[PDB]
Amino acid sequence: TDTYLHETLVFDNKLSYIDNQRDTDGPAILLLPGWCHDHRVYKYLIQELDADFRVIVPNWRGHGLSPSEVPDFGYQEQVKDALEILDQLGVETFLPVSHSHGGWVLVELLEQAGPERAPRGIIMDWLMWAPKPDFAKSLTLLKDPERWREGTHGLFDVWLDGHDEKRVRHHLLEEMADYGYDCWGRSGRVIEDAYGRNGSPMQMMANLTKTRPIRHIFSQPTEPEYEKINSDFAEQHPWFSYAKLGGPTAFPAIDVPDRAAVHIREFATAIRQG
Ligand SMILES: Cc1cc(=O)c2ccccc2[nH]1
Ligand SMILES: [K+]
């Protein structure tokens, strides 16, 4: 995967990004990381798609193999960064795919890019409802310069859901280990503000000027009440669908990459037709 890793100057920042520079029929597949992780979350998903698609994975400001303190930014800046990278590469039509709170970037990317460039979207494991007491408590801890690491440990416990899942534990304990208070504190502020300002991922997607096919694919939360908000939103919106992947962790791109990949291919094939 490091075979495909590049660096370029985006506005005032040097950002890393995966590009397999595959020469083939579109759309390109834009994999969008969440907060305080990088392209390494997608290394198994990249292997599923590598052969048949151009695969781009931008890293956010202060994100990558060598994390760094950088000035404050939000999901609006993540979208502009993602699009400046696509402009530099000469990419027109793309299928955005997000993990967790990468979702705020994806939905704003759909709005900013419009349904010509971005006719569909896949959001993976993104909390569709307003924060529950537990998660609200986690964001609080992430913003506390005293208690941010305690914050991340609580989240790691929720995401692993009691599983000895070797590849996901490697991602959280080795691949996220170099991220400090600067990223995590900012993730807490941006996510807490995203919910407060947009209400929920569902309110934000319903509010798009141009609604389009979006699929939520998730393994967590596993409770029937969470599946019901997805089914109820799906019944209300012809353009919304979900699949419960039944993987063990909140990281389906890592632990069920083959399942993640068939939903991406289905949406990529639908774009290729017409
Ligand atoms: C990678 C990743 C997933 C999440 O759900 C999340 C939530 C809060 C802060 C940072 C985060 N980072
Ligand atoms: K539907």
Residue numbers in the entry: 2 to 275
Per the authors:
Arthrobacter nitroguajacolicus Rü61a 1-H-3-hydroxy-4-oxoquinaldine 2,4-dioxygenase (HOD) and Pseudomonas putida 33/1 1-H-3-hydroxy-4-oxoquinoline 2,4-dioxygenase (QDO) were the first dioxygenases discovered to belong to the ABH-fold family. They catalyze the O2-dependent breakdown of N-heteroaromatic quinolone-type substrates with concomitant carbon monoxide production. Atypical for oxygenases, these enzymes promote the activation of the triplet ground-state O2 molecule without the aid of metal centers or external organic co-factors. Kinetic measurements indicate that their reaction mechanism relies on a fast initial step, during which the substrates' 3-hydroxyl group is deprotonated by the His-Asp subset of the triad, thus promoting its activation for molecular oxygen attack (step 1), whilst the nucleophile is not essential.
Normoxic and hyperoxic HODH251A–MQO structures validate S101 as an O2/H2O modulator. MQO, a non-reactive molecule structurally closest to the natural substrate, in which the hydroxyl group at position 3 is replaced by the –H substituent. As crystals of HODH251A typically diffract better than those of wild-type HOD we solved the X-ray structure of this variant in complex MQO under normoxic and hyperoxic conditions at the 2.0 Å and 2.1 Å, resolution, respectively. We next inspected electron density maps following the O2-pressurization experiment (40 bar O2 for 2 minutes). These do not reveal changes that we could positively ascribe to O2 bound at the R-site. Instead of the elongated electron-rich density observed for bound dioxygen in other systems, O2-pressurization led to a decrease in electron density at the R-site compared to that under normoxic conditions. Occupancy refinement of a water molecule at this location gives values of 0.67 and 0.48 in the two independent molecules present in the a.u. Remarkably, S101 shifts completely to the trans rotamer (χ1 values of 180.08 and 180.66°) with no indication of the alternative plus rotamer observed under normoxic conditions. Overall, these observations indicate that O2 most likely interferes with H2O binding at the R-site, and although disorder negates its positive identification, this nevertheless leads to the shift of S101 to the trans rotamer that, in agreement with the simulations, appears to be positively correlated with the presence of dioxygen at the R-site.
